[PDB]
Amino acid sequence: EFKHDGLISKPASAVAKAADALSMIPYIAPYAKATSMVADKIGKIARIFGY
Amino acid sequence: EFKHDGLISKPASAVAKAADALSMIPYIAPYAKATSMVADKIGKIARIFGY
Amino acid sequence: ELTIHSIASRMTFWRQFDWPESAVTDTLLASMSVQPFCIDTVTASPVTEIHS
Amino acid sequence: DNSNNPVGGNPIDNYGTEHAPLLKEDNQYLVYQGERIVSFKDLLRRYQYLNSYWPQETGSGFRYYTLDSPGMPIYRGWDPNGIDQGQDSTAGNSPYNFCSMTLLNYLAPAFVCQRGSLRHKWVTAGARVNSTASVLSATRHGVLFPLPLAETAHPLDNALVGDRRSELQEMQRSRLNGTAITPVRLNNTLEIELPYYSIGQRFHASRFLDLAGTGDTQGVEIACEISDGGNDANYRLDQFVSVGEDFTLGMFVGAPIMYFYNDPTAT
Amino acid sequence: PSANDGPSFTTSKTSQNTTSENVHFVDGDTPWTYDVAATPDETSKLSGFDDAGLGEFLSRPIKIQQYQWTPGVQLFQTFNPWSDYFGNADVLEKINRFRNLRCKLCLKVLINGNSFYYGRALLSYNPYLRNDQVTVNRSFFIQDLIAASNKPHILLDPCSSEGGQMCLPFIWPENYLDITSTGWEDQMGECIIHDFDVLRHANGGTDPITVSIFAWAEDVSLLIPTTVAAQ
Amino acid sequence: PSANDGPSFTTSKTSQNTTSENVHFVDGDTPWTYDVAATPDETSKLSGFDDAGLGEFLSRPIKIQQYQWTPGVQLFQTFNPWSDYFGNADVLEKINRFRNLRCKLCLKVLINGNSFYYGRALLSYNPYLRNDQVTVNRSFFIQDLIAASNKPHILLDPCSSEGGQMCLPFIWPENYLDITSTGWEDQMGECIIHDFDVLRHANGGTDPITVSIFAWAEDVSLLIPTTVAAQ
């Protein structure tokens, strides 16, 4: 979400060995925003889908 | 009040699902300022009324 | 009193019409549009007052 | 027996023992690429140069250049309503946009619906005269009437101060809509974002190509002071477009018909 | 389910038997189905407007009659509520491709009056009237108010300016009378307003007053579809 | 209750507020009521005929299109299911004094075929098409089947002679599109039948076969009454 220095705490671009869940579909909750949502509600690696 | 990075901790603009108390009237204590007051004394969502 | 709903919820006189003796069943007395902008104008050739 | 399936699908024995073996290579992007690109919504948030605009082409004297542009970037090719004019195949002339083909312009006519905020940057490169202290300003239009892409100059060098103020009040910068200003001598970059306000609209037509002749409901007016002296003839504005964070596209109904050609000679 | 479809859509094989509101399809084989997986949300339909629907269309009141008493002149009027309600142009588009009706037509009388007007009128209802060689419908006699006061009646006055609502039951020897046939609602009971003397006024006012008659069908059983235009 | 009434009838005083299906009556005083106490029995209404009612009228299928393949000739057809269903004469009497519609128009394709006929056609659906300056609707090109195979589509053949049912969701930027306005259903998605080559036959038979397209609205929300004739 809107947090101070959020790029440091991401895996942010890449391999991140447990980030080989590219074959998983993102689930969007029925009124989910992009910011304070599914990037924390799916998992740690939901930031490679753009969230 | 005068705090460091206060815009991050607001819901600040919008839906904020529990912020559908727009039908509530703001109560102003008998010598209440706007800054260190009713935005913390009414509730979390008293910042959509401008406080 | 700077809430929008505190200003807008005030019941304010808007207009006035009449109901004649010659009115019969199914006679229209007034028709009005359901919207916020209920104003009334007073023209007097240079000026045009808008009472809202 | 799966024999008229609209999506097909009946796997017959192919030439591999191991099914989909490149998903089991976890450390593949530690060797070759350094990164993996999975979604377009991540890649749509890179800014890309759209188009440049020269303020000393509209008025005369010292004036205030204003440009009504859509929030969504205009499209790249031979418009019937283009802002420029190119030499076509019949050795004549036709309207043409000399803008770039962004990823947003590529992806949007393949989807039905479109909703979201859109981000712009205005860069103000070129040359300039030493006697400038102008302010570059972006201000949004209403969501009832989409204005087309247009250019206007407001003169500020009149003898009357009131007839200068009446020109500053013909501008969208003077209105209650959202305004961002900056000084060109100190920052020269706006970095604005147009929100998605609407008259009860859940989305709009993502397959609408005529943005330069109609506009959309996220238009913005960009305003900058200009003088008629030389070395301001090279003063321009560069538009970089990207995509806000509440942006989404609808259902995919297939790629459009595409066309491949280089830019013609501008006439 | 399976076989090369994504999260946005679904390809399936539905049943051989397809029923949708009086049309059956007995298919020779299971067809294919492409669903675009479109579930809308709440705040996309207006809530609270289930009162005036299409199924309960015949329960909507229409003003079948309007009359005016003037001081010095009587009301002697005769109308058929079944032929006034179901002779409307807008209900006849809704009872159009049906055959059986079986309603119960409740009516209502509104009179505005004043404390200075006086006099009284009787509104009576004749129930069946098919092979009815009695219960005359003629000009005004004061002795037609004795036979009409045993029928379902209401008393309407301007002084208290009140009252008036009857239920008008179905009574008919068959159940589910036809809508196609000619004059299918005419011989099912009719109302007559007799006046006892004359409308009067105590200050010599001569303004007319209005007697309005509304009607609507209560428990409709409209159920067999046909291709014939319903009269 | 009391006051001189018998077992056959009832005189009462009902409420001042009378509601019956979008008409309210706020009466100045409690009116009088004459009930004839008519309760019918069972075996006076047909039971089991609640399937084709008036409220679910728009769920009734109508045959919007019919075509015939002949061996040697292709099917390239273009139709608008929303403009074919709601352009009917009989549904336009039922959506007549309403304003808001919001349906979901599910259609069905029936093809009879034979084991000797072969060939295949693609029926595709374009969802919204309001400010759509792409997705051409022109003469037949074989390269228009690549763009049309990503839209909601069904494959129809005569050999197995099967398949065909899509759901066609509402998709529209407003909720509850108007019925009064002109061309209110035209720009809401249309179907095109392309043919891949040509209908063929293996014994040299030249008889045509029929492709029938039915359509009906699924979850109707028809709710605001008005006096304007619905186009």
Coordinates of N, CA and C in Angstrom, one line a residue, chain D residues 43-50 102 118-122 191-193 239-244:
Chain D
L43 N 3.9 -3.9 -17.1 CA 4.7 -3.2 -18.2 C 4.0 -2.0 -18.7
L44 N 2.7 -1.8 -18.5 CA 2.0 -0.5 -18.9 C 2.4 0.7 -18.0
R45 N 3.2 0.4 -16.9 CA 3.5 1.5 -16.0 C 5.0 2.0 -16.3
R46 N 5.5 1.7 -17.4 CA 6.7 2.4 -18.0 C 6.2 3.6 -18.9
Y47 N 6.7 4.8 -18.6 CA 6.4 5.9 -19.5 C 7.0 5.8 -20.8
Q48 N 6.3 6.3 -21.8 CA 6.8 6.2 -23.2 C 6.4 7.5 -23.9
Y49 N 7.4 8.1 -24.7 CA 7.2 9.3 -25.4 C 6.1 9.2 -26.4
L50 N 5.1 10.1 -26.3 CA 4.1 10.2 -27.3 C 4.3 11.2 -28.4
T102 N 2.2 3.6 -28.6 CA 2.5 3.2 -27.2 C 1.9 1.8 -26.9
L118 N -5.1 7.9 -15.6 CA -4.0 7.9 -16.6 C -2.9 9.0 -16.3
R119 N -1.7 8.6 -16.3 CA -0.6 9.5 -15.9 C 0.1 10.1 -17.0
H120 N 0.5 11.4 -16.9 CA 1.2 12.2 -17.9 C 2.4 12.8 -17.3
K121 N 3.4 13.1 -18.2 CA 4.6 13.9 -17.9 C 4.8 14.9 -19.0
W122 N 5.1 16.1 -18.7 CA 5.3 17.2 -19.7 C 6.7 17.8 -19.4
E191 N 4.1 15.9 -14.1 CA 3.9 14.6 -13.6 C 2.5 14.5 -12.9
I192 N 1.5 14.6 -13.8 CA 0.1 14.7 -13.4 C -0.6 13.3 -13.5
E193 N -1.8 13.2 -13.0 CA -2.6 12.0 -13.1 C -4.1 12.4 -13.2
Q239 N 5.4 15.0 -24.4 CA 4.4 14.3 -23.6 C 4.8 12.8 -23.4
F240 N 4.9 12.4 -22.2 CA 5.2 11.0 -21.8 C 3.9 10.5 -21.2
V241 N 3.4 9.3 -21.7 CA 2.1 8.8 -21.2 C 2.4 7.5 -20.4
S242 N 1.6 7.3 -19.4 CA 1.5 6.0 -18.7 C 0.2 5.8 -18.1
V243 N 0.1 4.9 -17.2 CA -1.2 4.3 -16.7 C -1.2 4.3 -15.2
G244 N -2.3 4.8 -14.7 CA -2.5 4.9 -13.3 C -2.8 3.6 -12.6

